[PDB]
């Protein structure tokens, strides 16, 4: 249905050897398609998906220019932030940036995002209305005033509601076979006794795309959060995801328990029983 394009930028200052390390990644939903690494011998925006390889050399030359300008600005902002927080040169610090857009099933703009961090803490963010900023601390207020004076929110909105949505729309058409797909999870259940009176029931979900999934254990049709372990959704490595949820049940009561699997790739949510 609805789709998203996100860009994740990381800049880490190296007080030791050389200028800061800059890493940039691009996602279309849960699929990576572009990458830029300052340490890599390439020094260009590199393709990570087969459908992005159909873009012209002007696209790759443009995207590289943007990444060089992104890294140099990040290198300058690392120094600016050191002064703002009154920190020494010997310490290693990080700048993280997130921006992108959401489109509906029809391809219409839904949401635009612009968020910045310093040392994994909120610094400055553009609000949902895309007109105002949210400054986390006193140091961020200095940045906010500078950006209000230069009308930065309007320039960010023009990108988010323009080239960002236009780019995402193009990528979704170019990569329909892989991006519009809904790979359902391959569900199975394991039973392992810990004693003669206790047993572990584990419900699996493998090979699914997108990553969004719900695994809920029930006892007599009532949600079971107690005596349950739900691991974080993890990448399999082939563009697909994995997740499991286990519950410790008394021996003989196995059939009172059900696992409910919700995924957009499933026509009806599954109900598994041992």
């Amino acid at each position: 249905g609805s789709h998203s394009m996100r860009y994740f930028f990381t800049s880490v200052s190296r007080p030791g050897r050389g200028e800061p390390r800059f890493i940039a990644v691009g996602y279309v939903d849960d699929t990576q398609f572009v990458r830029f690494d300052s340490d890599a011998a390439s020094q260009k925006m590199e393709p990570r998906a087969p459908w992005i390889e159909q873009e012209g050399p002007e696209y790759w030359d443009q995207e590289t220019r943007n990444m060089k300008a992104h890294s140099q600005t990040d290198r300058a902002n690392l120094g600016t932030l050191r002064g703002y927080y009154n920190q020494s040169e010997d310490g290693s610090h990080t700048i993280q940036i997130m921006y992108g857009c959401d489109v509906g099933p029809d391809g219409r703009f839904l949401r635009g995002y612009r968020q910045d961090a310093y040392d994994g803490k909120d610094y400055i963010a553009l609000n949902e209305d895309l007109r105002s900023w949210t400054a986390a601390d006193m140091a961020a207020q200095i940045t906010k005033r500078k950006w209000e004076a230069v009308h930065a929110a309007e320039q960010r909105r023009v990108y988010l509601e323009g080239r960002c949505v236009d780019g995402l729309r193009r990528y979704l058409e170019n990569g329909k076979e892989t991006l519009q797909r809904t790979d359902p999870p391959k569900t199975h259940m394991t039973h392992h006794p810990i004693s003669d009176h206790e047993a572990t029931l584990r419900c699996w979900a493998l090979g699914f795309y997108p990553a969004e999934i719900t695994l809920t254990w029930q006892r007599d049709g009532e949600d079971q959060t107690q005596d349950t372990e739900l691991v974080e959704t993890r990448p399999a490595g082939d563009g697909t995801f994995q997740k499991w949820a286990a519950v410790v049940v008394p021996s003989g009561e196995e059939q009172r328990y059900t696992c409910h699997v919700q995924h957009e790739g499933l026509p009806k949510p599954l109900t598994l029983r041992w």
Binding site: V34, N66, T73, T80, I97, I124, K146, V150, C164
Partner: peptide, 9 residues
């Protein structure tokens, strides 16, 4: 596609 310029703090 990505932004052309990044703003200074």
């Amino acid at each position: 596609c990505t932004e052309l310029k990044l703003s200074d703090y």
